[PDB]
Structure formats: structure tokens, C-alpha cells
């Protein structure tokens, strides 16, 4: 075991003396401080004393008339959120917090037996963290009782690998995609298959996307969008289980499809092209984006989190009526969408060309900004729950953070020793769990841009990781065939 060099005798002598008392008697600011909304609003050059964080929060609350805490950041150089009073017009930039705190995850629970093959995918239920479903190489899929950490309501009927598994935003239906050219819908509370398996695809399903609740008709059930390696996408109606519209604009395998909050569908394909499709216009393409040199992998949107957990929140409270659920989903979508002062959603496209592009498909067809610097292909990209930051995973063992507002690079989360497959954002946006080909999982804290804790214990490569809506539990799955649950 190689050890850090020990301190010298001079270091010991220096440390033996007292110093660094935090009396801070007066610390009267030399320059006035003003509050400005981070988004667009400037709100007033005050000259207060050594006011604490609570005092600043109270001042902002009484300015807003709520005396809703906001996180105070200095001028973005310093870029440091009395915290900033040590460095000395000064402007303090604040953003809504959406008060919540996900307890850091540092311990596992147990190693659970199950599928006799590597785990492939997982997804926590949008409404409760007590139930979760994992897809694995074994043809069967199993739902796990996250409380007791035991299998429950095993899904059977498939005859090939369960490539992808997704949970409906309403939490009433589970959609599972397998290497076989079929998709099956299952009741989470019984495991029964909802009618005959969806069929019509010529090749295995690559990804699944559920229609957002706020766009669905009041009282009706959401549709299910699916993508296949053949390059075609079908919009399946969960009621009739029949694909109303088939789209095959992509000339190669479709990497994934994302259902935007505006009703448009954005998908990446192996043809090095990104296409925007509108469900309203009888499922017809509207625009084509051509900037990636290599194929596009894992297209993502800023609103993905809200759409996934539409009508729900970290508290897990369920809606009473369909109208209330739709209203809550619309409010949740607007909260992130209207952060710019106008209804807009950002889209980030990743590709194996060592570059990622930021797009506003509705506003303009040109890329807003180009994110570059990775040494290898970017496997995974995950927008923050509020769109504040963009994080991407690459095979070069490095994870990079980019500003979600303009795509500017922020920092690189170093520490991984193997290719990073996928990452999942925390509900409060404070933490970020990540998995890599190496033997251990890792979680990063965006606030300090530093590693939070290493989570070893997996016996082989880990391909799947997800964070619960409430943030209480984190699941994972890998080549070891053992499903692991992690929580504070």
C-alpha cells in the first residue's frame, strides 16, 4: 500500500501552533452587495454588515414578499457561492432551490439472488421507491420489493434478453423491451401481461419512451413510443395496443427516442442524423439536424425528469383525480420549462465523435453550442432535474460537467479507472450517482465538484444504475447477476 508522504518536522512544528481563529469581529464589506436573479431579473446596492446566510435568505424572502429560499452565488474568476467576504460593485446571483435534500448514499443493503444472467436495465417507480423493476439477460423480468429487498411479481413471457424496461409516468403499467421483436405491458401489482405482446418490429427494441401525462387527454391513458434496431419507431396506444403511426425516416438503427414536453419526438440513430418528429402532425418529421460526424447515442432532454415523474414528486403523494394529476404534471413541467422566463426546453445530443451538441429544436435548427473535449465516445448524458447543469459519461474514464444554460464546460469529475456507462441525477440535483466498467460505483457532488463517496461491492461490471424519485434508495445491476440496493 503506497502511502502519502508523511509531514516533515517543520510541518509538525507549524501545526503545533494555534491559528485560524474565526472571530470575524466586524468584516464590514468594502463594496456594496446587490441581489440579481440568476435567470433574467436584476433586483439596490446595499451595504449590510457581516450578515449570515440566514439573514441573506430572509432579505431575499422579504424582497420577494414571501417572508422560498434561494441559493446565493457570487459573480460568475471568483465563481464562489460571509463565504465570499474573505476575498475582498458586487452582485449576488440567486436561483430557486426547490427546497429538498437527498441524504447521501454511502452503504449497500444486501446481495439479492435472481436472474441467472447479467442485469441489463432498471427503473424506479415514479410514485414510490418501494417497488422497482430490473431487466436482465434472462428472458424473465422481476420486480423487486425495495423495502425487504426480495423479488416479487416476476414477469414471464419473453424468450430473449430484456434489453430495456420502462415504467409509465402514471405508475400503472410497466413496458419491457426485449431482444425479441416484441414489447410487453405488465401490471406492476400482479405481473399479468396486459393483452398480447406488442408485435410488428423487425429487430430488437433499442429504447422506450412514454407520452407525458400533461399532454395526454384528460382521463385517457398515455401512449408508448418505442424504437428498434431496424431504424423504425412505432407509437403504441396502450389501450388498443396497436401502433397508430410508424416512422422510418432514420436510415440506420435508432439509438433512442425522447418524447418532449411540447409533443415533439427527438431520436438519435446510427445514420449520424437527429430528426425531430411531431406526433400532432400525424407523426411526421418537421426538421432534420445534421452536425454529428459519428452516430448519435443517448439523446436526452432537459424536461426528461419532470416528464418521467410527471404528476409526482419526491414526497410520493399521489393525485386524487385525473384533472388534478394533469394540473400537477403541467405545473412540474412548467417549473423547469419556464426557468428562462419563457416556455423553452433544451436538448443535448451525444455521439461517438468525442463531441456533444446543444440544440433548441423548436426555436432554431442550428446548434446553440458545441460541447467538446472528451477523449473517447460519450456513452451517457443526463440533464439535471432543473436543467442547471449537463453531465456526460465517456469511455475515457472521465465525467464532465457542462452549463445547461449555454453548454459551457464547468468541471471534470475525475476518479474513475474504467469506461463510464451511465449516470443518474439526484432528485435535489445536489448529488450524481455514476457507474463504470470497473468493479466499484461512484457518486459525485455537483456543489463542490468533488467525489462524495466510493460504493464498491459489485463483483463485476455494472451496466445499470438508477436513483429513486424520493432519493431514499439507489439500485444497480451488473455482470455479477446480483442486484444491489444502496441508501443512506
Amino acid at each position: 500500500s503506497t502511502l502519502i508522504p508523511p509531514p516533515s518536522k517543520k510541518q509538525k512544528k507549524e501545526a503545533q501552533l494555534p491559528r485560524e481563529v474565526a472571530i470575524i469581529p466586524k468584516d464590514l464589506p468594502n463594496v456594496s452587495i446587490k441581489f440579481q436573479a440568476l435567470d433574467t431579473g436584476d433586483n439596490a446596492l446595499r451595504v449590510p454588515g457581516a450578515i449570515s446566510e440566514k439573514q441573506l435568505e430572509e432579505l431575499l424572502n422579504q424582497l420577494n414578499g414571501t417572508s422560498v429560499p434561494y441559493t446565493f452565488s457570487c459573480t460568475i474568476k471568483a465563481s464562489d457561492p460571509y463565504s465570499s467576504l474573505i476575498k475582498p460593485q458586487i452582485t449576488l446571483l440567486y436561483t430557486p432551490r426547490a427546497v429538498f435534500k437527498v441524504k447521501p448514499v454511502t452503504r449497500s443493503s444486501s446481495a439479492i439472488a435472481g436472474h441467472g444472467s447479467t442485469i441489463l436495465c432498471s427503473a424506479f417507480a415514479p410514485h414510490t421507491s418501494s417497488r422497482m423493476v430490473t431487466g436482465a439477460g434472462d428472458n424473465t423480468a422481476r420486480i423487486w420489493d425495495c423495502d425487504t429487498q426480495t423479488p416479487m411479481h416476476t414477469l414471464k413471457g419473453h424468450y430473449n434478453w430484456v434489453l430495456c424496461v420502462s415504467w409509465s409516468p402514471d405508475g400503472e403499467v410497466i413496458a419491457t423491451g426485449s431482444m425479441d421483436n416484441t414489447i410487453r405491458l405488465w401490471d406492476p401489482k400482479s405481473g399479468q401481461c396486459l393483452g398480447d405482446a406488442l408485435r410488428g418490429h423487425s429487430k430488437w427494441i433499442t429504447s422506450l419512451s412514454w407520452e407525458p401525462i400533461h399532454l395526454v387527454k384528460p382521463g385517457s391513458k398515455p401512449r408508448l413510443a418505442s424504437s428498434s434496431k431496424d431504424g423504425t419507431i412505432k407509437i403504441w396506444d396502450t389501450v388498443s395496443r396497436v401502433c397508430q403511426y410508424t416512422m422510418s425516416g432514420h436510415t440506420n438503427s435508432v439509438s433512442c427516442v425522447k418524447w418532449g414536453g411540447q409533443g415533439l419526438l427527438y431520436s438519435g440513430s446510427h445514420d449520424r442524423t437527429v430528426r425531430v418528429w411531431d406526433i400532432n402532425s400525424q407523426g411526421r418529421c418537421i426538421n432534420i439536424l445534421k452536425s454529428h460526424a459519428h452516430w448519435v447515442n443517448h439523446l436526452s432532454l432537459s424536461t426528461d425528469y419532470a416528464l418521467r415523474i410527471g404528476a409526482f414528486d419526491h414526497t410520493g403523494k399521489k393525485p386524487s383525480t385525473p384533472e388534478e394529476a394533469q394540473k400537477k404534471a403541467l405545473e412540474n413541467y412548467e417549473k423547469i420549462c419556464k426557468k428562462n422566463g419563457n416556455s423553452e426546453e433544451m436538448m443535448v445530443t451525444a455521439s461517438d465523435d468525442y463531441t456533444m451538441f446543444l440544440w433548441n429544436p423548436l426555436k432554431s435548427t442550428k446548434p446553440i453550442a458545441r460541447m467538446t473535449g472528451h477523449q473517447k465516445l460519450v456513452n451517457h448524458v443526463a440533464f439535471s432535474p432543473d436543467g442547471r447543469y449537463i453531465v456526460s459519461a465517456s469511455f475515457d474514464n472521465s465525467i464532465k460537467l457542462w452549463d445547461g444554460r449555454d453548454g459551457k464546460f464547468i468541471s471534470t469529475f475525475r476518479g474513475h479507472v474504467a469506461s463510464v456507462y451511465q449516470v443518474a441525477w439526484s432528485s435535489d440535483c445536489r448529488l450524481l450517482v455514476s457507474c463504470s466498467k470497473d468493479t466499484t460505483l461512484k457518486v459525485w457532488d455537483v456543489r463542490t465538484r468533488k467525489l462524495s463517496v466510493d460504493l464498491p461491492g459489485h463483483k463485476d461490471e455494472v451496466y445499470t444504475v438508477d436513483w429513486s424519485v424520493d432519493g431514499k434508495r439507489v439500485c444497480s445491476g451488473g455482470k455479477d447477476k446480483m442486484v444491489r440496493l444502496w441508501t443512506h
Binding site: 441524504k103 443493503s109 444486501s110 446481495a111 439479492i112 423495502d147 425487504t148 426480495t150 416479487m152 441508501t487
Partner: protein
């Protein structure tokens, strides 16, 4: 975390160390289970698991982890289980209380070599058997077996179950509801 089992009752207590004597920070007993709807088998495996979960969640809530604090983070409450003179045998309901406490948020460092269903031929825990034991599956199986065996024993044993009109699946449902109420 001191867990002791007596006749008709289960005693679980979180205990610290002091010169004047041990001090209890929180305590729970099986006789409080009826508060959550559990009326029979207060000293059984499922009751032990429920009591462990209840005490763990209660102490977690009292400590402020849910719903000199300097030097973040919250420093989760780690506790070591103590069973006194209770024998170390795989499947013992004491290990069931340990599992319940672990599920409740108390991170007791423990291996799965003594949970029910742990086979010696293969070093793997059978989660189905553990779930059955947690949800009183063994009790329901015994009731089903007695349903076609001599009725005198079935009328003496499980007499409370017959009085309350309990059945095989109703026992598991009651245990799940009791766990939810405890939470």
C-alpha cells in the same frame, strides 16, 4: 442495539454505555404491535422483524434523520446488535429482528450467513424463503397443513386466528399493513 426475546413478548432497546449504568435512548416491545393490527404470534419471526423495523424507524425519526451537528454530513446512526445469551443459529428470529432493523434504516454491520433460507451446500441466500419468513409464510403454510389434518390441534393452535377469521393470505396482508402503519 440490545435485542432480547422472552415468552409472549420481544424486547428491543438501543442502549449506550455509561459508568453509572447503561442508558436507553429508545425502546420498543412486541406488546405494542397490536397498535398496528398484529394480534397473534407476537414472539414469532414476523413479529420480531416488525419490532426491529419499528424500533429502527422510531429511533431514526427521533434522531432527526427523517421528516453538536457541526461537521456535516448527518453521520447516520450505526449500531451493533447484541443478543446476550441467545444462541447463534441460522434462521433465528433474532436475526429476523436484525433484518427488520436494517430495513428500517439502522445500519448494523452483519453478514447474511444466519438469515433463514441460507443454505450450507451453496453460499447463497434464498430471497424467496426470507420474504416468506418475513411475511409469515411459514405460519400460513402451517395453517394450510392443519386445515386438512386433525382439527383438535387446529382448534387449539391458531385459536386466535380462527376467532379473528384469519386465513393464509390475510396473515400476509395484515403483516404488510402493520409494516406500513409502523412506517
Amino acid at each position: 442495539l440490545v435485542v432480547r426475546f422472552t415468552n409472549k413478548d420481544i424486547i428491543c432497546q438501543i442502549i449506550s454505555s455509561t459508568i453509572t449504568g447503561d442508558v436507553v435512548l429508545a425502546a420498543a416491545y412486541s406488546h405494542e404491535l397490536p397498535r398496528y393490527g398484529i394480534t397473534h404470534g407476537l414472539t414469532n419471526w414476523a413479529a420480531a422483524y416488525a419490532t426491529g423495523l419499528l424500533i429502527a424507524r422510531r429511533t431514526l425519526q427521533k434522531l432527526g434523520l427523517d421528516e453538536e451537528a457541526v461537521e456535516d454530513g448527518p453521520r447516520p446512526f450505526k449500531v451493533f446488535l447484541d443478543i446476550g445469551l441467545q444462541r447463534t443459529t441460522t434462521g433465528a428470529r433474532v436475526f429476523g429482528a436484525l433484518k427488520g432493523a436494517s430495513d428500517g434504516g439502522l445500519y448494523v454491520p452483519h453478514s447474511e450467513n444466519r438469515f433463514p433460507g441460507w443454505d450450507f451446500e451453496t453460499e447463497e441466500i434464498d430471497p424467496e424463503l426470507l420474504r416468506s419468513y418475513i411475511f409469515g409464510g411459514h405460519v400460513s403454510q402451517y395453517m394450510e397443513e392443519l386445515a386438512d389434518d386433525d382439527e383438535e390441534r387446529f382448534s387449539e393452535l391458531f385459536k386466535g386466528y380462527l376467532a379473528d377469521d384469519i386465513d393464509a393470505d390475510s396473515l400476509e396482508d395484515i403483516y404488510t399493513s402493520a409494516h406500513e402503519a409502523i412506517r
